[PDB]
Amino acid sequence: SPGIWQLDCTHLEGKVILVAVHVASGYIEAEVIPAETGQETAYFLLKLAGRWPVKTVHTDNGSNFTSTTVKAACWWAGIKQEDGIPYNPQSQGVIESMNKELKKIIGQVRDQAEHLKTAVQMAVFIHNHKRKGYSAGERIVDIIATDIQ
Amino acid sequence: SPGIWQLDCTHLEGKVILVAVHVASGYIEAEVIPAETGQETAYFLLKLAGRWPVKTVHTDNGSNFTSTTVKAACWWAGIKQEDGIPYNPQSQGVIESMNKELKKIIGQVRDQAEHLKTAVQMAVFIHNHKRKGYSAGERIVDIIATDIQ
């Protein structure tokens, strides 16, 4: 449960939005990058792992799984790097539905921000605070706290 | 006090490291920026508040306290923006000691990274996982979970 995350990469406005989803809670972090490279992916994972107790990351595609730079960050940060094969086919629909939710939010805030990166961070904020009633941000803290105790 | 954070701005290699400290745990997030501007500060705060339940931020200086862009982000993200006057003189000492610790860690990793941004993220990671015993990353999750319950 508490340490498992899934990467996800989606596109908008000719840019790349890289997302990490905490699988058990639905909580996310995200960033905008000009292109998905192993270097950008590795730096994103190093950031994530300094902030939450990341035990395992299921990579978003085979290029990030293969990337020696990504493996070198997973080594550095103590992360088990795994593939993202949807052995549970539900995973695939959950990611697609998150991407559509995020893009919807982004369009709802898009005119309040000059830069796509601001709009994506507003979308992260709304996503993580939304009550569905607990929010994803409340669920991730409860799950990890429960595990620490 | 679960939602109280303090901003902190330190310099290294002619660049600026902006830090947010969670006061009750000592957990931190940080980024490297070319210069501290209201726009960079505001974006950093929007990021922090989408990730943790930020109720109040004590700003690191009067220019960020004054900055309308910074106040616009605190409004957007639901944050109470406050000054960082050390009414408790112990505050000054704690931040000064954290900056010295971070810089020490950055020097210990500095040659594993081409870019300062990497070294700073490695320093965030070591700082937050350090057991003093619980780690800052454990303490923040325990404090907020206790508050949610």
């Binding site: 590795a42 730096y43 730079t69 | -």
Partner: peptide, 8 residues
């Protein structure tokens, strides 16, 4: 470059 963030 023999660095974690630049293996070259």
């Amino acid at each position: 470059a023999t660095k974690i963030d630049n293996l070259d």
